[PDB]
Design a protein around this motif. Structure first.
Motif, PDB file in Angstrom:
ATOM      1  N   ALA A   1       8.664  86.510  41.455  1.00 46.82           N
ATOM      2  CA  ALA A   1       7.386  87.023  40.953  1.00 46.82           C
ATOM      3  C   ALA A   1       7.526  87.768  39.627  1.00 46.82           C
ATOM      4  CB  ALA A   1       6.738  87.924  41.992  1.00 46.82           C
ATOM      5  N   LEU A   2       8.762  87.980  39.194  1.00 46.74           N
ATOM      6  CA  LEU A   2       9.020  88.666  37.934  1.00 46.74           C
ATOM      7  C   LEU A   2       9.024  87.682  36.772  1.00 46.74           C
ATOM      8  CD1 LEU A   2      11.764  91.182  39.038  1.00 46.74           C
ATOM      9  CD2 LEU A   2       9.323  91.581  38.632  1.00 46.74           C
ATOM     10  N   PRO A   3       8.735  88.171  35.556  1.00 46.85           N
ATOM     11  CA  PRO A   3       8.870  87.394  34.313  1.00 46.85           C
ATOM     12  C   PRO A   3      10.321  86.990  34.033  1.00 46.85           C
ATOM     13  CG  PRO A   3       7.451  89.282  33.975  1.00 46.85           C
ATOM     14  CD  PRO A   3       8.057  89.457  35.331  1.00 46.85           C
ATOM     15  N   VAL A   4      10.510  85.976  33.194  1.00 38.80           N
ATOM     16  CA  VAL A   4      11.826  85.391  32.931  1.00 38.80           C
ATOM     17  C   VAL A   4      12.799  86.321  32.202  1.00 38.80           C
ATOM     18  CG1 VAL A   4      13.044  83.516  31.749  1.00 38.80           C
ATOM     19  CG2 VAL A   4      10.880  83.078  32.872  1.00 38.80           C
ATOM     20  N   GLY A   5      12.281  87.237  31.397  1.00 34.95           N
ATOM     21  CA  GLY A   5      13.161  88.069  30.597  1.00 34.95           C
ATOM     22  C   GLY A   5      13.593  89.402  31.189  1.00 34.95           C
TER      23      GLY A   5
ATOM     24  N   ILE B   1       4.356  86.897  46.115  1.00 38.58           N
ATOM     25  CA  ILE B   1       4.668  86.104  44.931  1.00 38.58           C
ATOM     26  C   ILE B   1       3.429  85.364  44.447  1.00 38.58           C
ATOM     27  CG2 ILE B   1       6.234  84.429  43.906  1.00 38.58           C
ATOM     28  CD1 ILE B   1       7.868  84.704  46.604  1.00 38.58           C
ATOM     29  N   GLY B   2       2.908  85.788  43.299  1.00 41.60           N
ATOM     30  CA  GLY B   2       1.811  85.097  42.647  1.00 41.60           C
ATOM     31  C   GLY B   2       2.357  84.173  41.574  1.00 41.60           C
ATOM     32  N   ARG B   3       1.544  83.215  41.134  1.00 43.12           N
ATOM     33  CA  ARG B   3       1.982  82.222  40.152  1.00 43.12           C
ATOM     34  C   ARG B   3       1.908  82.736  38.714  1.00 43.12           C
ATOM     35  NH1 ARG B   3      -0.344  76.294  42.197  1.00 43.12           N
ATOM     36  NH2 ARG B   3       0.572  76.402  44.300  1.00 43.12           N
ATOM     37  N   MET B   4       1.150  83.811  38.514  1.00 45.00           N
ATOM     38  CA  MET B   4       0.929  84.380  37.185  1.00 45.00           C
ATOM     39  C   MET B   4       1.905  85.527  36.913  1.00 45.00           C
ATOM     40  SD  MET B   4      -2.260  82.658  37.164  1.00 45.00           S
ATOM     41  CE  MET B   4      -1.132  81.366  37.681  1.00 45.00           C
ATOM     42  N   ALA B   5       2.793  85.746  37.875  1.00 48.12           N
ATOM     43  CA  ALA B   5       3.737  86.865  37.925  1.00 48.12           C
ATOM     44  C   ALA B   5       3.062  88.235  37.758  1.00 48.12           C
ATOM     45  CB  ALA B   5       4.823  86.677  36.860  1.00 48.12           C
ATOM     46  N   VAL B   6       3.793  89.193  37.183  1.00 48.26           N
ATOM     47  CA  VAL B   6       3.349  90.592  37.054  1.00 48.26           C
ATOM     48  C   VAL B   6       4.123  91.256  35.901  1.00 48.26           C
ATOM     49  CG1 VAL B   6       3.592  92.906  38.184  1.00 48.26           C
ATOM     50  CG2 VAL B   6       2.474  91.059  39.426  1.00 48.26           C
TER      51      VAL B   6
END
Ligand SMILES: [Mg+2]
Ligand SMILES: [Mg+2]
Ligand SMILES: [Mg+2]
Ligand SMILES: [Mg+2]
Ligand SMILES: [Mg+2]
Ligand SMILES: [Mg+2]
Ligand SMILES: [Mg+2]
Ligand SMILES: [Mg+2]
Ligand SMILES: [Mg+2]
Ligand SMILES: [Mg+2]
Ligand SMILES: [Mg+2]
Ligand SMILES: [Mg+2]
Ligand SMILES: [Mg+2]
Ligand SMILES: [Mg+2]
Ligand SMILES: [Mg+2]
Ligand SMILES: [Mg+2]
Ligand SMILES: [Mg+2]
Ligand SMILES: [Mg+2]
Ligand SMILES: [Mg+2]
Ligand SMILES: [Mg+2]
Ligand SMILES: [Mg+2]
Ligand SMILES: [Mg+2]
Ligand SMILES: [Mg+2]
Ligand SMILES: [Mg+2]
Ligand SMILES: [Mg+2]
Ligand SMILES: [Mg+2]
Ligand SMILES: [Mg+2]
Ligand SMILES: [Mg+2]
Ligand SMILES: [Mg+2]
Ligand SMILES: [Mg+2]
Ligand SMILES: [Mg+2]
Ligand SMILES: [Mg+2]
Ligand SMILES: [Mg+2]
Ligand SMILES: [Mg+2]
Ligand SMILES: [Mg+2]
Ligand SMILES: [Mg+2]
Ligand SMILES: [Mg+2]
Ligand SMILES: [Mg+2]
Ligand SMILES: [Mg+2]
Ligand SMILES: [Mg+2]
Ligand SMILES: [Mg+2]
Ligand SMILES: [Mg+2]
Ligand SMILES: [Mg+2]
Ligand SMILES: [Mg+2]
Ligand SMILES: [Mg+2]
Ligand SMILES: [Mg+2]
Ligand SMILES: [Mg+2]
Ligand SMILES: [Mg+2]
Ligand SMILES: [Mg+2]
Ligand SMILES: [Mg+2]
Ligand SMILES: [Mg+2]
Ligand SMILES: [Mg+2]
Ligand SMILES: [Mg+2]
Ligand SMILES: [Mg+2]
Ligand SMILES: [Mg+2]
Ligand SMILES: [Mg+2]
Ligand SMILES: [Mg+2]
Ligand SMILES: [Mg+2]
Ligand SMILES: [Mg+2]
Ligand SMILES: [Mg+2]
Ligand SMILES: [Mg+2]
Ligand SMILES: [Mg+2]
Ligand SMILES: [Mg+2]
Ligand SMILES: [Mg+2]
Ligand SMILES: [Mg+2]
Ligand SMILES: [Mg+2]
Ligand SMILES: [Mg+2]
Ligand SMILES: [Mg+2]
Ligand SMILES: [Mg+2]
Ligand SMILES: [Mg+2]
Ligand SMILES: [Mg+2]
Ligand SMILES: [Mg+2]
Ligand SMILES: [Mg+2]
Ligand SMILES: [Mg+2]
Ligand SMILES: [Mg+2]
Ligand SMILES: [Mg+2]
Ligand SMILES: [Mg+2]
Ligand SMILES: [Mg+2]
Ligand SMILES: [Mg+2]
Ligand SMILES: [Mg+2]
Ligand SMILES: [Mg+2]
Ligand SMILES: [Mg+2]
Ligand SMILES: [Mg+2]
Ligand SMILES: [Mg+2]
Ligand SMILES: [Mg+2]
Ligand SMILES: [Mg+2]
Ligand SMILES: [Mg+2]
Ligand SMILES: [Mg+2]
Ligand SMILES: [Mg+2]
Ligand SMILES: [Mg+2]
Ligand SMILES: [Mg+2]
Ligand SMILES: [Mg+2]
Ligand SMILES: [Mg+2]
Ligand SMILES: [Mg+2]
Ligand SMILES: [Zn+2]
Lengths: 240, 46, 147, 110
Positions: A127-131, A110-115
């Motif tokens: 780690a995924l984006p919100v949408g 899990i990175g803070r900038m996601a993927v």
RNA sequence: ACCAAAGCUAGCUCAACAACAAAUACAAAAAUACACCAAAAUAAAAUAAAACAUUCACCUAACAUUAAAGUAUAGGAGAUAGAAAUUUUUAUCCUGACGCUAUAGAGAUAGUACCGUAAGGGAAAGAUGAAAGAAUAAAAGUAAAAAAAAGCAAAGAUUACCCCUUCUACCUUUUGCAUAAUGGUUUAACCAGAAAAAAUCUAACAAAGAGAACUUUAGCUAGAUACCCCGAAACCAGACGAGCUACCCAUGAGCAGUUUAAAAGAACCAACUCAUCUAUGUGGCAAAAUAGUGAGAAGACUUGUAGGUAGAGGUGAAAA
RNA sequence: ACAAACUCCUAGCCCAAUACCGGACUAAUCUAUUGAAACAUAGAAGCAAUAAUGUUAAUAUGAGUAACAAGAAGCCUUUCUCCUCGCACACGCUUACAUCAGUAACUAAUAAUAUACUGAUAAUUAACAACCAAUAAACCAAAACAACACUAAAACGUUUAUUAAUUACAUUGUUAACCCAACACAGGAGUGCACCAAGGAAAGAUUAAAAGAAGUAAAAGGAACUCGGCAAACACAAACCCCGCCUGUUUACCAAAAACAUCACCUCUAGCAUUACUAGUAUUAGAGGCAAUGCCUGCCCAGUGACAAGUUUAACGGCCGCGGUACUGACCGUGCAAAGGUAGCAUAAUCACUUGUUCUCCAAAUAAGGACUUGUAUGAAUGGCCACACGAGGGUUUUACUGUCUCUUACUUCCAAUCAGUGAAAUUAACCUUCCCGUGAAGAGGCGGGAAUAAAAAAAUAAGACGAGAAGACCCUAUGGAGCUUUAAUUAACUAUUCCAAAAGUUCUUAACAUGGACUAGCAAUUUCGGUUGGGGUGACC
């Protein structure tokens, strides 16, 4: 009198294993669930639902896997993909557009900038984006995928609170899950499963479904169109 | 159609349903043997 | 092959106890009948000259005692030897202690014969029932006069 | 239909002793001048027809021996012979059966 | 004159007293290889209460015996159920029979034949004599000995069988039966009234009577006099049944030809499967058939072997 | 005058009877004493069958009746004359098989003689078939003449590694004409090759009546037969309806249908893991409804539900008056409702009227189809309406065909009748068993008044014997049963629910088990369903 179940296998083989179907009966040989039996004879093919699964116990890091083939399965409604890396082969549930000769990424990081993820991607929920659009969602971290496996279904990530993601299941009930749970990004394969027409009664006996009873019954108080306020959120996070 | 031929002989089914072992496996089977000994039958079990 | 509809059932006992004084007066009447028909003979002693049964049979004949004969002695231990032997060898003659006198046997033998102490015995026992009270408890228990 | 009453033995004696159910006495019996057995006037003598039959059977056996097989049968007339007999010219050119028994008295020479 | 008929025994009742050896739980009777063993939860109802719901002795236990007593009590206070305190009891020895004789008495000559898949049901019979190392003619049914106008079958009679004359079979059931109401072919053997409160009768002894406990204003004690047989549909518990059939689970096996690009719950038509319609058959060839005629015939198809689900249940393309 | 059980007369042992109740005697047993050949006083009882569709055994009647079987000739196994479920294995049967011998009588449904009865003796021989290793690891890739594919996603193992007693000959199945149906059953039976090379006889002998069964042919006519063109045809074709959409499935043994199912369309109920559902996861899975497709699916939350007051009909279920007016009523008034039946369709597989009205159809039609149509009791997922394609469904017309019929006929075969064997069934108070008209418990072979009338067989026909079969399935009555349903009355166990205690901890909580007492439901128990009645019900009464 007695019976023995068919499900004894201790080891994971990708070679299809012979399965013995039991129409409707429990282990005491009585009908429990009506209207099952006489299907076309099927083999079973083992699925690995824990997608992040370090192969050699020693090295912890992320996986890169390859899609060798995409096949039909009789056991489930979705289409299955044969995925290999290192010395290991597995049957995993295929995402909608996955083609043979493909590359898949599995990471628990899990990175803070996601993927930004492809369909054949499996990441931790947090780690995924919100949408994003998800399937094969795991309940408690390390338990494997349970929800949203069926043909052409998808969940969606909604919000994140206190290191805990909220997802929306296909029935639109909302599910509260720890951030460390892995999920796959995309739709399940064969989205047209819903529009298939069963031509004759024959197809039913082929799928292994028996005709209904001939007993006629008044509809009870249970029948009518009930409009319910949507069932509240399910929370798999336990308090300290 | 026409009836009375109901009994279709099989040696395996005969020993498996009514044979000495089948009797001895269950308590009530045992009592079948017991009652049949008390009446003193030439043949206890199929 | 069926069951019998009514038929005899179980071991059955016929048992009824006549009131005492009826049994007693029955005994009296039997003695009386015996005497008034001349078929009673009172004897004394009862010592026999010999143990030979032929003596007893001839003794029946010479006295014209009739066909069968019963003899009654006071006690069972006090019976003289010759008599015991000679009588125990015969069917038509018969020998009994006085405790065992009874009506049926008195009627079964044409001729009754009593020892003298036996008369002294019977007369007493039987006569005792005219003058008695009705029993309080079983007579075997202690009473003033009665043993 | 079921009989309404048991019939008495009287009624049965009437029915089954009737002069029609009795066996008639055959009046045509005679004796046969040869063997003196009994025969009916219009029928051949049984006992005579017997010895005729036996001899026919035996002569057919010997003429079965004179024939080689099932389908092979003679085109000539046949003449049967007995011990001591020799064929006449009328009878020569014909198949001949030779037999041990001297010719039986009832069978003529002709 | 046939068919038959007769024996007295096998054994039973009731009661006192107290041939190894081998083989076996493999699909029992198969010497021999890796396991497992083993388990327990109130008896219910039929029936009494003239129905039926609370309730209904006996059915488990021992406790016996004479009493207290059918009393205290308990009960839709109904039906019925029912104690204890406290009292009584001499030994063994001394075995038999007003118990049955082959339709009886054991079911028994047998748990056998036989009938059931199975739990389970369950028979019938023997007769000479010292010696076979001596060869009564009496049931019905018939025969000896077909039957002669007429009539519940006989009776009054007659010299005389008929012929005359006079008479509605018998039980049961009913107001009333010759009824054309029920029952029975006939013979033999089996096959159905049990109780002692009150009473009456006969005796004992009597203000008392009973061989203990009780009852007594002529009573007590004893004897004798009394109340059937065969039948449901049911209901409850525990076994045994899925070799038929219902549906499944294994593992096998069939489907030629002809037509069509086609194995397409498509055509045509065999094997194979069903059962439409008619006639035979109706104690049949058959406890559901045969002859013709019909539907389906690469499918929700037919079919073999072997498992499974068991009655308060199973299974059901519901026909309860 | 003749006429009784009445009354005289002559003698007596001196006056009827069902239910119930009194008396006197006695048959046959056994036991006490007598008795001696059958006994007489007592005491005892398994103490007396002309009747239970009584039980067992045996005999009749029906009855020598119904019904059963062996192709011909010969020299005696050799030719003929005809028809075709044949040989193996599996399962299952157990000596039924083989040889020699005997059959008086047993088995054969008869004989002859014998694969099936009786005795003695023998017999199937293993290479076929049964029995006949484990554990690790690689291997995604259908059978279908298999190139390659199709959807419904397919039974089956090789090879490498580690150990596996190592050693002639183990043990067991081997016959058959056979098995399951009480039978030496016109029936039920899996598989591989066969259509004969293999299997077998439809007639015991006659005679040629009726009536029955099966088949063939028929002048003229061609449905005039009849519920119906059912059956049968030198025919084998067309059309119209109703109901189901369709192939399919069911009342083994009186119903294969319009009933059920079903593609499709909709309602509900579920957010999850080791034995079902499911090694599944809301496009999924369970309870159901209605039946494809096409056009549609109206208005109604007041009742009862069911849900979590409110909400719901593709839940149970409903969807109107009364009079006034242009013959009618678009309008009008007022009343009640939760809404006031619409789109369709319509005399109907739709209470009655009812053979509604009229047209077409035929010489004539209560049939059929088309219309009109308030159906006052149609009507839209308890589905409404049209339509292909399909029905062993129901109805109607036509063509054609014919013995269905006008109106029957000829001839064959099975039965049939006579001869010879063997030989049942229901039934039966006894019958020496007429007709008429009266009578009578109300329909007489038996009574009354008349008639008629030697005796028995065989063959026919069915008017009677309230004929034979089943202690009437109708009806009513038992304080008889059972199944089904609910608002009958009493209510547990269980499965779920909710609560209070208990239990653990906090300073108010409940993770999974889990007990006590409640509650609310489901599934479910136990028991009944009064009586009079001019039969019962409804009505009325007690
Ligand atoms: Mg599935
Ligand atoms: Mg359905
Ligand atoms: Mg339905
Ligand atoms: Mg049977
Ligand atoms: Mg007996
Ligand atoms: Mg009662
Ligand atoms: Mg009663
Ligand atoms: Mg009752
Ligand atoms: Mg009880
Ligand atoms: Mg006996
Ligand atoms: Mg048996
Ligand atoms: Mg006689
Ligand atoms: Mg006369
Ligand atoms: Mg009269
Ligand atoms: Mg009667
Ligand atoms: Mg009457
Ligand atoms: Mg009458
Ligand atoms: Mg009658
Ligand atoms: Mg009657
Ligand atoms: Mg009768
Ligand atoms: Mg008394
Ligand atoms: Mg007195
Ligand atoms: Mg009850
Ligand atoms: Mg009852
Ligand atoms: Mg089974
Ligand atoms: Mg089965
Ligand atoms: Mg084909
Ligand atoms: Mg087809
Ligand atoms: Mg025909
Ligand atoms: Mg066809
Ligand atoms: Mg067709
Ligand atoms: Mg079915
Ligand atoms: Mg129904
Ligand atoms: Mg019904
Ligand atoms: Mg006069
Ligand atoms: Mg009188
Ligand atoms: Mg008697
Ligand atoms: Mg008698
Ligand atoms: Mg009868
Ligand atoms: Mg009788
Ligand atoms: Mg006879
Ligand atoms: Mg006759
Ligand atoms: Mg005949
Ligand atoms: Mg023949
Ligand atoms: Mg075999
Ligand atoms: Mg014979
Ligand atoms: Mg074997
Ligand atoms: Mg075998
Ligand atoms: Mg063989
Ligand atoms: Mg049979
Ligand atoms: Mg013949
Ligand atoms: Mg004829
Ligand atoms: Mg004809
Ligand atoms: Mg013709
Ligand atoms: Mg013609
Ligand atoms: Mg007509
Ligand atoms: Mg007409
Ligand atoms: Mg017509
Ligand atoms: Mg026809
Ligand atoms: Mg119509
Ligand atoms: Mg249909
Ligand atoms: Mg089909
Ligand atoms: Mg069927
Ligand atoms: Mg049927
Ligand atoms: Mg039918
Ligand atoms: Mg339907
Ligand atoms: Mg839904
Ligand atoms: Mg529709
Ligand atoms: Mg609607
Ligand atoms: Mg309208
Ligand atoms: Mg109508
Ligand atoms: Mg309506
Ligand atoms: Mg509705
Ligand atoms: Mg309706
Ligand atoms: Mg179609
Ligand atoms: Mg059909
Ligand atoms: Mg049709
Ligand atoms: Mg004859
Ligand atoms: Mg006459
Ligand atoms: Mg009259
Ligand atoms: Mg008359
Ligand atoms: Mg005849
Ligand atoms: Mg007649
Ligand atoms: Mg009569
Ligand atoms: Mg009649
Ligand atoms: Mg009756
Ligand atoms: Mg009733
Ligand atoms: Mg009742
Ligand atoms: Mg009760
Ligand atoms: Mg009533
Ligand atoms: Mg009444
Ligand atoms: Mg009335
Ligand atoms: Mg009346
Ligand atoms: Mg009323
Ligand atoms: Zn001669």
């Amino acid at each position: 009198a007695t019976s023995v179940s068919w499900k004894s296998r201790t080891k994971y083989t990708v070679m299809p294993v012979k399965m013995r179907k039991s129409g409707g009966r429990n282990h005491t040989g009585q009908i429990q669930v009506h209207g099952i039996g006489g299907g076309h004879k099927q083999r079973y093919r083992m699925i690995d639902f824990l997608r992040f699964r370090p192969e050699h116990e020693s090295k912890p890091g992320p996986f890169e896997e390859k899609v060798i083939a995409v096949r039909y399965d009789p056991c489930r409604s979705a289409d299955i993909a044969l995925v290999a890396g290192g010395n290991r082969k597995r049957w995993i549930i295929a995402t909608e557009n996955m083609k043979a000769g493909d590359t898949v990424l599995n990471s628990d990081h899990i990175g803070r900038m996601a993927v930004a993820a492809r369909e054949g991607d499996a990441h931790p929920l947090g780690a995924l984006p919100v949408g994003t659009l998800i399937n094969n969602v795991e309940s408690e971290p390390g338990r494997g995928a349970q929800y949203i496996r069926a043909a052409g279904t998808c969940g969606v990530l909604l919000r994140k609170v206190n290191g805990t993601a909220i997802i929306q299941l296909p029935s639109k009930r909302q599910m509260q899950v720890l951030e460390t749970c892995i999920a796959t990004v995309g739709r399940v394969s064969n989205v047209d499963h819903n529009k298939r027409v069963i031509g004759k009664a024959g197809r039913n006996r082929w799928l292994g479904k028996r005709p209904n009873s001939g007993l006629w019954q008044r509809k009870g108080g249970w029948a009518g169109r009930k409009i319910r306020p949507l069932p509240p959120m399910k929370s798999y996070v336990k308090l300290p | 159609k026409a009836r009375g031929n109901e009994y279709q002989p099989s040696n395996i089914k005969r020993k498996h349903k009514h044979g000495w072992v089948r009797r001895l496996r269950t308590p009530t089977g045992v009592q079948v043997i017991l009652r049949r000994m008390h009446k003193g039958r030439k043949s206890l079990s199929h | 092959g069926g069951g019998v509809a009514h038929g005899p059932r179980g071991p059955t006992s016929y048992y009824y106890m006549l009131p005492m004084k009826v049994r007693v007066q029955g005994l009296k009447v039997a003695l009386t009948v015996k005497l008034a028909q001349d078929d009673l003979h009172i004897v004394d002693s009862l010592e026999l000259p010999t143990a030979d049964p032929q003596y007893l049979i001839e003794l029946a004949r010479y006295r014209r005692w009739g066909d069968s004969v019963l003899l009654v002695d006071l006690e069972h231990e006090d019976m003289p030897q010759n008599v015991v032997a000679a009588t125990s060898g015969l069917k038509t003659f018969n020998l009994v202690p006085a405790v065992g006198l009874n009506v049926h046997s008195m009627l079964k033998h044409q001729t009754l014969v009593l020892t003298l102490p036996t008369v002294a015995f019977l007369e007493e026992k039987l006569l005792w029932h005219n003058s008695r009270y009705t029993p309080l408890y079983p007579f075997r228990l202690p009473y003033c006069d009665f043993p | 239909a079921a009989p309404k009453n048991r019939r008495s033995i009287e009624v049965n004696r009437c029915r089954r002793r009737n002069p029609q159910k009795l066996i008639k006495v055959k009046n045509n019996i005679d004796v046969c001048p040869e063997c003196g057995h009994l025969k009916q006037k219009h029928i051949l003598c049984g006992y005579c027809y017997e010895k005729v039959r036996k001899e026919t059977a035996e002569i057919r056996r010997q003429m079965g021996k004179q024939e080689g097989g099932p389908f092979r049968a003679p085109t000539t007339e046949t003449v049967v012979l007995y011990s001591g007999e020799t064929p006449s010219e009328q009878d020569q050119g014909k198949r001949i059966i030779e037999r041990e028994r001297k010719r039986p008295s009832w069978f003529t020479q002709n």
